[PDB]
Design a protein around this ligand. Structure first.
Ligand SMILES: NC(=O)c1cccc(N[C@H]2O[C@H](COP(=O)(O)OP(=O)(O)OC[C@H]3O[C@@H](n4cnc5c(N)ncnc54)[C@H](O)[C@@H]3O)[C@@H](O)[C@H]2O)c1
Length: 180
């Protein structure tokens, strides 16, 4: 079945996320622009989607990469090396859509052939799920905080549960996302 639980790395703390949920950047509803990295923060910063992963490890690799960038910066004399990152554990519902199936629906209908046909399961956004527009706070179950001390190298991990989380039987949508 589609996953009931997904994960999201984010820099923002639970005082924000546990109360307000996640809100997408904007109204850019183009799935292909989102999945290929064009409409999030380092691009046009207007995507209508919020990425998550069914694989906790995927989000841990993301956190580890961002922490390592802070470390490299300290060594280059460009920062103190400190880093705080968060991994949120989230209940998926019918407003969460598989990236792989959504990608294929889009490119089969509107794409050219680039990456349409030669696109295996491990290669094609294997574990990514897109929440459309919002991840409400009631879906956000808990968070792991990882703090790296840039000066001593000590890394400390803590956990917090969201009092606003609602436990209900939901899973991600079985169908691809389609706009409109
Ligand atoms: N985030 C994940 O764990 C994740 C899980 C599975 C797959 C992916 N694959 C994505 O990686 C790339 C980066 O994804 P995100 O980190 O989700 O990109 P965002 O732009 O949503 O978030 C980056 C940062 O931008 C900030 N932010 C994000 N949304 C808002 C907002 N609405 N308002 C203010 N700040 C915001 C916040 O600092 C956040 O950590 C995307 O191009 C896409 O390919 C990401």
């Amino acid at each position: 079945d589609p996953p009931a639980t997904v994960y999201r790395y984010d820099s923002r703390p639970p005082e924000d996320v546990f109360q307000n949920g996640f809100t997408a950047w904007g109204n850019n509803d183009n799935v292909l622009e989102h999945l290929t990295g064009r409409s999030s923060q380092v691009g046009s910063s207007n995507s209508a989607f919020v990425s998550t992963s069914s694989s906790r490890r995927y989000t841990e690799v993301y956190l580890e990469h961002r922490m390592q960038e802070a470390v490299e910066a300290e060594r280059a004399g460009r920062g103190t090396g400190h880093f705080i990152g968060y991994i949120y554990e989230v209940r998926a519902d019918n407003n969460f859509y598989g990236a792989a199936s959504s990608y294929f629906e889009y490119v089969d209908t509107y794409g050219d052939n680039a990456g349409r046909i030669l696109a295996g399961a491990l290669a094609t956004y294997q574990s990514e799920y897109l929440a459309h527009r919002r991840i409400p706070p009631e879906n956000i179950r808990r968070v792991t905080r990882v703090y790296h001390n840039g000066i001593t190298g000590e890394t400390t991990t803590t956990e917090y549960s969201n009092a606003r989380y609602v436990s209900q039987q939901t899973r991600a949508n079985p169908n691809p996302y389609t706009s409109r």
